[PDB]
Structures are given as C-alpha cells and as structure tokens.
Structure 1
C-alpha cells in the first residue's frame, strides 16, 4: 500500500549487519526506514543486499509493519543500487 511513488532519497546510514537503515527523502527531508529485503535492484557485484551512505536512491514509501518503510529501492531510473562500503565484491 503506497504513500508516495518514485521519490528520490539520500541514504542516511545503513548497517549491513543489522540489515536495515534510513533513507532521507530529497522529497520531504523526512527519514524513511529501509530493510534489506526492500532492495529491488541490488548491485550484482556485491554478495549481500545493502545501500551505501550518501547514495541516491529511487523508492516508494509504503505502509509497513510498524509504520512507513521504503520499498522497491533502486538507483535513479531503476538502475541497480550502489550498495554499502562494507558489503564485499564478488
């Protein structure tokens, strides 16, 4: 269930271990929760699913289990996300 569509955001921080983090909406300057499984287009050259700090993503703000969460996170245009510094190359 969608609150906002194809909104652009700047990833605030993402702990690759915990499997979640926050995306700051360029849209509204609000922080939005993001979980590893919401990453629709992951970097094919990284083992794990992650986003990197300072990275610009395109996502949907959906209603989640405990309030709003990000969904179908991709890069701008739908390109694969870049992924975290701490996720390893294949």
Structure 2
C-alpha cells in the first residue's frame, strides 16, 4: 500500500461499531474513503469515530480502494 495524501480533513458519514468500519467523506474532493477501526488512533470502543465528526487522516491506496489511515481529530 502507498500513501497518496496526508493531513486530509473529512467528515464521518457513518461508522458501524458492530462490523468495525465506515466511510469518511473527504472535504477536498468530496469522495468517500473507507475507514476500518484499526486505522483510528486511540481515543470502551477504543477505536471508533462518530457520525458527523470532522477528522484528519492520511489516505492510502491498497487495491481494494482508497482508505483512511492514522485517523485523528483535526490538528
């Protein structure tokens, strides 16, 4: 996998804690990026984000598609 962007801001569309993934909409391109629970930095759902939350992340591209990495609060 390769890093294709860093310090991207986005808004969480939805995140399902049962299945452990969701999608973030990038504020710069308006495209959704997949986010898995393991990509979220520790905040008891130790790795989760909330629907509607603004987050900052890197985008990396394995060939299942573009996915978020190192997901944190803005700044």
Q: Same fold (TM over 0.5)?
A: yes
Provide structure 2 residue ranges, at least 5 long, that are not aligned to the other structure. none
Matched, 1:56 2:57: no
Taking the aligned partners of 2:70 and 2:61, their CA distance within structure 1 comes to 13
RMSD: 1.5
TM-score (norm 2): 0.89
* Length-normalised TM-score, structure 1: 0.75
Runs of 5+ unmatched residues, structure 1 = 77-90
Distance 1:55 1:69 in 2: 17
Q: What are the superposed Cα offsets for residues 10-58 of structure 1, whole Å, 9 maximum, x if unpaired?
A: 0000001100000001111000000000002429xxx441110000000
Q: Give the conservation status (yes or no) of the 8 Å contact 2:41–2:47.
A: no
- Specify which structure has the higher proportion of strand: 2
Larger radius of gyration: 1
Quote how far apart the aligned CAs of 1:65 are: 5.2
